UniProtKB/Swiss-Prot annotation, chain A:
Active site: 101, 125, 241
Gene3D superfamilies: alpha/beta hydrolase
Stated name of the protein: Zearalenone hydrolase
EC number: 3.1.1.-
Class of the enzyme per the UniProt entry, highest EC level: hydrolase
Binding site for zearalenone: 31, 101-102, 182, 186, 219, 241
Impact reported for residue 101 to A: Abolishes the catalytic activity
Effect listed in the UniProt record for changing residue 152 to H: Maintains the catalytic activity for ZEN but shows a 3.7-fold increase in specific activity against alpha-ZOL
Keyword hit for Ion transport: no
Swiss-Prot record, chain B:
Oligomer and partners: Homodimer.
Keyword Hydrolase assigned: yes
Pfam families tied to this protein: Abhydrolase_1
Any GO BP: response to toxic substance
PANTHER family the record matches: AB HYDROLASE-1 DOMAIN-CONTAINING PROTEIN, HYDROLASE, ALPHA/BETA FOLD FAMILY PROTEIN
Organism classification: Eukaryota, Fungi, Dikarya, Ascomycota, Pezizomycotina
Organism: Bionectria ochroleuca (Gliocladium roseum)
Protein name as it appears in the record: Zearalenone hydrolase
Annotated consequence of substituting residue 191 to S: Strongly reduces the catalytic activity
Gene symbol of the encoding locus: zhd101
Length: 267, 266
């Protein structure tokens, strides 16, 4: 496993990890931007004959050395441009991509905006609606935000409390710092940027969409409706918002099988 | 509120309730077949200018005087035929219908099978897949079944435990007796009978489909997919499997507003 940093012309110094040889699979984090959440799955996926790349997102965790524009007023389209920049730096020309949450928005924007670069995209629980209770955290003090959102992550959306806690002190200390950054740059601007207003643009695209099996129906109801309207493959993963944490083996198998499906269809 | 009984020539003596005057709205119970779950909402809906009818289902609660075939090997098509028989007996010629669970299967079967009789149907959380863990309760002893399913209702799918408990001791005593009847006669045969194999048959029909907002996505995921494929209105009610128990005012409002929408359209 390569663990290193790389700087892109847009001023971001990325922390990234890479393991394996074979077709490229890129795991884009959710809004918290923390790629250690992929640790177990990276090895399982790479072992099936893929080169797997992941990274902390700009302004978050180990990728914090970045211009303020990259973690304020954040949109799917901004994030997609940043991901393209690190793929360029790493000489990854053709990638399968995964993303959850703002990462889901990002990978659909990637697929639509850079079709020559993206073999297929897997999106999970893509936020399309403004949620005032999240947006309103942005005006609180840093420690108040971190306390509130740490609680929300563990109790409301982790999909597995034991697994979430078992990420450990080092990861959670990084998440603690990230929560105010996410709170002030994401909730207000990510949902209106969702690249799913044009249903016909999605039709026929190599997109595989999932929602958590245990997630309350109302949370990503709109995803299921939108995917079905566009004829896009839609299904479920165990857990809720973080299947790569709660169910890393099932997650890895899904990513491998889905990538294999598209490698067959490509030929 | 009229509370009475009526006997249909298929051998069922129904317990039923009616309140109000105006267009007919009929509330079909879920598989537990217990119409006291509608008590609050019946009054609220009727007050908006409707005649509201509901009833215990065959073999359940106060409608227990019924032949074994009406509560064993139960299908959506069987239940639809029974509901038509009581509508006939009460001289209800054109009805808006609500149903959840097996009641949802029933009202879709009613709409498709008897389009002249059904103004519009509201279906909620319609089961289309066999669940082994539910089917397997059919071979346990009665008291084992009641203990298991009473817990599942209270703690897993009620959508509001306080409201569920507040149905009261008499209701839960009736449910206690119903759980084994439901276990033996419904889970194994209701889902394969789901009238949703033909999406094109649903298209353009006066159907409004809901799922509980708090229900785990995987429970009625298929409902949302099927409704969307057919272009059928699909949305959410608060709670889970029993919105008429957990959120009776919201439930009543939904039934009234949906009926009014279709009265305008017609
Ligand atoms: C992991 C996630 O990317 C960031 C933490 C917030 C969270 O998990 C809440 C549940 C999912 C909501 C995502 C969401 C919701 C919004 O209204 C706006 C937005 O930008 C993202
Ligand atoms: C109230 C409900 O009508 C009867 C109690 C069982 C329950 O609530 C479990 C959750 C919803 C499942 C209904 C269901 C599931 C099946 O596999 C087969 C079937 O016939 C009905
Ligand atoms: K697993
Ligand atoms: K209510």
């Amino acid at each position: 496993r390569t663990r290193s940093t790389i700087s892109t012309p847009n001023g971001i110094t990325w922390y990234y990890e890479q393991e394996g040889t074979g077709p490229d699979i890129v795991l884009v984090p959710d809004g918290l931007g923390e790629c250690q959440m992929f640790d177990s799955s990276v090895s399982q996926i790479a072992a099936q004959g893929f080169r797997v790349t992941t990274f902390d997102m700009p302004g978050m965790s180990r990728s914090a050395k970045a211009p303020a524009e990259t973690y304020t007023e954040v949109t799917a389209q901004k994030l997609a441009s940043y991901v393209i920049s690190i793929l360029d730096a790493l000489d990854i020309k053709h990638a399968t991509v995964w993303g959850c949450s703002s990462g889901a928005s990002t990978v659909v924007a990637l697929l639509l905006g850079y079709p020559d670069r993206i073999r297929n995209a897997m999106c999970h629980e893509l936020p399309t609606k403004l949620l005032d209770h999240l947006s309103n955290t942005a005006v609180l003090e840093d420690e108040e935000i971190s306390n509130i959102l740490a609680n929300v992550m563990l109790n409301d959306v982790s999909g597995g409390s034991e697994a979430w806690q078992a990420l450990g002190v080092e990861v959670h200390a990084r998440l603690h710092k990230n929560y105010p950054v996410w709170a002030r740059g994401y909730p207000r601007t990510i949902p209106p940027s969702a690249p799913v207003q044009d249903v016909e643009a999605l039709r026929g695209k190599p997109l595989d969409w999932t929602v958590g099996a245990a997630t309350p129906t109302e949370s990503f109801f709109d995803n299921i409706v939108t995917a079905t309207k566009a004829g896009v493959n839609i299904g479920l993963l165990p857990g809720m918002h973080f299947p790569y944490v709660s169910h890393p083996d099932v997650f890895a198998k899904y990513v491998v099988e889905t990538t294999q499906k598209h490698l067959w269809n490509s030929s």
